[PDB]
Design an enzyme around this catalytic site. Structure first.
Site, PDB file in Angstrom:
ATOM      1  N   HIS B  41      52.495  19.862  49.642  1.00 20.40           N
ATOM      2  CA  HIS B  41      51.701  19.771  48.587  1.00 20.40           C
ATOM      3  C   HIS B  41      52.281  19.522  47.276  1.00 20.40           C
ATOM      4  CE1 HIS B  41      51.525  24.180  48.364  1.00 20.40           C
ATOM      5  NE2 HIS B  41      51.967  23.950  47.260  1.00 20.40           N
ATOM      6  N   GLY B 143      52.898  29.538  42.037  1.00 23.60           N
ATOM      7  CA  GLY B 143      54.265  29.067  41.852  1.00 23.60           C
ATOM      8  C   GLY B 143      55.177  29.616  42.869  1.00 23.60           C
ATOM      9  N   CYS B 145      54.282  29.580  46.023  1.00 25.75           N
ATOM     10  CA  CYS B 145      54.310  28.427  47.458  1.00 25.75           C
ATOM     11  C   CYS B 145      55.974  27.992  47.673  1.00 25.75           C
ATOM     12  CB  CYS B 145      53.429  27.337  46.910  1.00 25.75           C
ATOM     13  SG  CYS B 145      53.378  26.812  45.145  1.00 25.75           S
TER      14      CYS B 145
HETATM   15  C1  LIG Z   1      51.642  26.146  44.852  1.00 29.88           C
HETATM   16  C2  LIG Z   1      50.909  27.665  44.441  1.00 29.88           C
HETATM   17  O1  LIG Z   1      51.179  28.538  44.109  1.00 29.88           O
HETATM   18  N1  LIG Z   1      49.274  27.354  44.723  1.00 29.88           N
HETATM   19  C3  LIG Z   1      48.655  26.261  45.148  1.00 29.88           C
HETATM   20  C4  LIG Z   1      49.009  25.933  46.730  1.00 29.88           C
HETATM   21  C5  LIG Z   1      48.090  24.794  47.268  1.00 29.88           C
HETATM   22  C6  LIG Z   1      47.476  24.074  46.434  1.00 29.88           C
HETATM   23  C7  LIG Z   1      46.895  22.834  46.980  1.00 29.88           C
HETATM   24  C8  LIG Z   1      45.362  22.788  46.593  1.00 29.88           C
HETATM   25  C9  LIG Z   1      47.078  22.634  48.489  1.00 29.88           C
HETATM   26  C10 LIG Z   1      47.353  21.555  46.196  1.00 29.88           C
HETATM   27  C11 LIG Z   1      47.248  24.515  45.114  1.00 29.88           C
HETATM   28  C12 LIG Z   1      47.923  25.562  44.294  1.00 29.88           C
HETATM   29  C13 LIG Z   1      48.571  28.501  44.602  1.00 29.88           C
HETATM   30  C14 LIG Z   1      47.046  28.592  45.256  1.00 29.88           C
HETATM   31  O2  LIG Z   1      47.373  28.609  46.619  1.00 29.88           O
HETATM   32  N2  LIG Z   1      45.643  28.464  44.473  1.00 29.88           N
HETATM   33  C15 LIG Z   1      44.462  28.388  45.426  1.00 29.88           C
HETATM   34  C16 LIG Z   1      43.523  28.594  44.596  1.00 29.88           C
HETATM   35  C17 LIG Z   1      42.242  28.719  45.581  1.00 29.88           C
HETATM   36  C18 LIG Z   1      41.733  27.477  45.575  1.00 29.88           C
HETATM   37  C19 LIG Z   1      43.023  26.496  46.477  1.00 29.88           C
HETATM   38  C20 LIG Z   1      44.247  26.711  45.606  1.00 29.88           C
HETATM   39  C21 LIG Z   1      48.950  29.839  44.734  1.00 29.88           C
HETATM   40  C22 LIG Z   1      48.510  30.934  43.919  1.00 29.88           C
HETATM   41  C23 LIG Z   1      48.904  32.506  44.344  1.00 29.88           C
HETATM   42  C24 LIG Z   1      49.576  32.554  45.387  1.00 29.88           C
HETATM   43  N3  LIG Z   1      49.607  31.836  46.264  1.00 29.88           N
HETATM   44  C25 LIG Z   1      49.673  30.370  45.949  1.00 29.88           C
HETATM   45  C26 LIG Z   1      51.662  25.227  43.779  1.00 29.88           C
HETATM   46  C27 LIG Z   1      52.480  26.059  42.415  1.00 29.88           C
HETATM   47  O3  LIG Z   1      52.492  24.249  44.140  1.00 29.88           O
END
Ligand SMILES: *[C@@H](C(=O)N(c1ccc(C(C)(C)C)cc1)[C@@H](C(=O)NC1CCCCC1)c1cccnc1)[C@@H](C)O
Ligand SMILES: *[C@@H](C(=O)N(c1ccc(C(C)(C)C)cc1)[C@@H](C(=O)NC1CCCCC1)c1cccnc1)[C@@H](C)O
Lengths: 305, 305
Positions: B41, B143, B145
């Site tokens: 992603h 961040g 991830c």
């Molecule tokens: C990674 C990142 O840190 N997070 C993340 C992961 C995946 C995505 C998608 C939707 C696959 C593009 C977005 C963002 C966040 C995270 O997982 N946020 C979620 C909140 C609830 C709805 C779905 C998204 C994350 C936050 C805290 C801990 N771990 C992961 C990004 C920085 O690339």
């Protein structure tokens, strides 16, 4: 989201761990620049443990009586001295992996990471607090002596603890890196007891702020209190007295959450008097006191090193 | 003595963490030999997050669209591919700090250490268990991830987890290093719920043996039980069913303590039915299930790496 007991990354300290042998005792040493630091009881034998005369025991030791190994390499010992309860062995090679470092003596209530080692090799890493009675509730087996505790600020390692001994009660005692014990403990096999183990109030409050930040809000009550009134309650539950310095240190977390510190004190007061009623806070069924306000901010803001 | 949630020393993994940027997303990557592994992603933008077509999104990306930095050095990307939910970026430099390593897919109930990272830099390390519902209860901010989980056997790092996402409930989901999610989760911003979170019975039993080894014996009762009778009780408390394989795995701890596994099951049964009555076990007021039998043996026997 989430909240865990989190240690510092240990790589910078791993590269400093060595094995020190003298006669027939082996333990861990810390190799920084051209000096190896280790507990002085490495020079003890079985018959000296009840009341060792360390200065007398050192008369019997020359440089070549100290075997120092880093991996499969031995460093040549070219001088030795005793500083309080630590031995300082000068070697002829500076550690190429020496990080930027400082020696610090921490205050009770502050936290640090421990790299538990055996025979100069790392076994694991975990977070500890210096208790108000100057013990730590660690995980240490025979041979762990000389393992170190540390904090990291970006690129600088602040070494604050060297493990020396286990008390008969199973808690742990050690020194700063200048060899001065934390607390009244002495490095001999005699009856030593720790004093009363009180709870670090400012750390409990910090952890309650961590819980609010993570959405665990059930304990937020509808009272406030005063410092003197809260401290009457904290005294009955063997909590440390809360001071205005502590309130100020909680300032960042208060500003982030919008919860005044004295309001959070009132919530803690009700938790102390009524218990948690079978509920949990951040996955724990008791009030956690081994996270500092800085620990909470670091973990809830993603500080890296 | 003592018993702590203990992570593996993280130095070998620290040297593998890099930063990966694509367009405007940055996250963490794992650099081993001449390949960088990261969540796919990284190629998503704001408008693609609800239902991204990852293969279509990759058509738009060439090697030079991936920025990979290790410290202040950038590795030249000379190929890229998608394997399940991970991207594999071939770089022109092998990581000089690559440890001996393997990729492993762990079973529910097994534990590992997490090195939480932001922008390719380590923040902290802690121990996790893969829950029976294939989530982990981590500590991860935006961040994080691409942070990885791992075990170490002497000198070999077994990577078992790459962090991908947080669920709306605040628990965490990710993949093995071949990019296959643990559990039913998908890397998109859609309503995903975890199933029932059951307790890892064999781990609770291992921790009770750890408690006996440390002298906490108050819970040892005067009954025994049978596998089928214990499992009727475990089912009502959402504990995993205990099997003879689990009994055999507890063999080392049973032999060390002299407490038959079914006797320990009877003690757990009474703890489940009567609670702990305000008492604690190894400093905890609830039954801990994130220590495996191997974890207990390692910590109670001083295994090093
Ligand atoms: C990674 C990142 O840190 N997070 C993340 C992961 C995946 C995505 C998608 C939707 C696959 C593009 C977005 C963002 C966040 C995270 O997982 N946020 C979620 C909140 C609830 C709805 C779905 C998204 C994350 C936050 C805290 C801990 N771990 C992961 C990004 C920085 O690339
Ligand atoms: C260090 C070592 O591991 N331990 C140790 C430390 C100090 C001493 C003295 C008496 C100063 C020579 C002996 C042994 C043990 C330890 O502290 N044992 C104590 C048990 C109760 C009576 C006093 C000694 C240790 C064990 C577990 C955790 N930490 C330390 C030695 C291998 O050099």
């Amino acid at each position: 989201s989430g909240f865990r007991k989190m240690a510092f990354p240990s790589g910078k300290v791993e590269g400093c761990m060595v094995q020190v042998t003298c006669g027939t005792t082996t333990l861990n040493g810390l190799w920084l620049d051209d000096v190896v630091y280790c507990p002085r009881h490495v020079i003890c034998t079985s018959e000296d443990m009840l009341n060792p005369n360390y200065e007398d025991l050192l008369i019997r030791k020359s440089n070549h009586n100290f075997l120092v190994q880093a991996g499969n390499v031995q460093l040549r010992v070219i001088g030795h001295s005793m500083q309080n309860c630590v031995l300082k062995l000068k070697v002829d090679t500076a550690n190429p992996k020496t990080p930027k470092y400082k020696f610090v003596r921490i205050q009770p209530g502050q936290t640090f990471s421990v790299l538990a080692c055996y025979n100069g090799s790392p076994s694991g890493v975990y977070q500890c607090a210096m208790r108000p009675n100057f013990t730590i509730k660690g995980s240490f087996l025979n041979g762990s002596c000389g393992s170190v505790g540390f904090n990291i600020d970006y690129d600088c390692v602040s070494f604050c603890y060297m493990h020396h001994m286990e008390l008969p009660t199973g808690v742990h005692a050690g020194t700063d890196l200048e060899g001065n014990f934390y607390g009244p403990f002495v490095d001999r096999q005699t009856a030593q007891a720790a004093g009363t183990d009180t709870t670090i109030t400012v750390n409990v409050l910090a952890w309650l702020y961590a819980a609010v930040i993570n959405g665990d809000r059930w304990f937020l009550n509808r009272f406030t209190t005063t410092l003197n009134d809260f401290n009457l309650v904290a005294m009955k539950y063997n909590y440390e007295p809360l001071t205005q310095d502590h309130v100020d240190i909680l300032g960042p977390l208060s500003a982030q959450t919008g919860i005044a510190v004295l309001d959070m004190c009132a919530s803690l007061k009700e938790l102390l008097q009524n218990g948690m009623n079978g509920r949990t806070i951040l996955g724990s069924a008791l009030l956690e006191d081994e996270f500092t306000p800085f620990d909470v901010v670091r973990q809830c803001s993603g500080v890296t090193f």
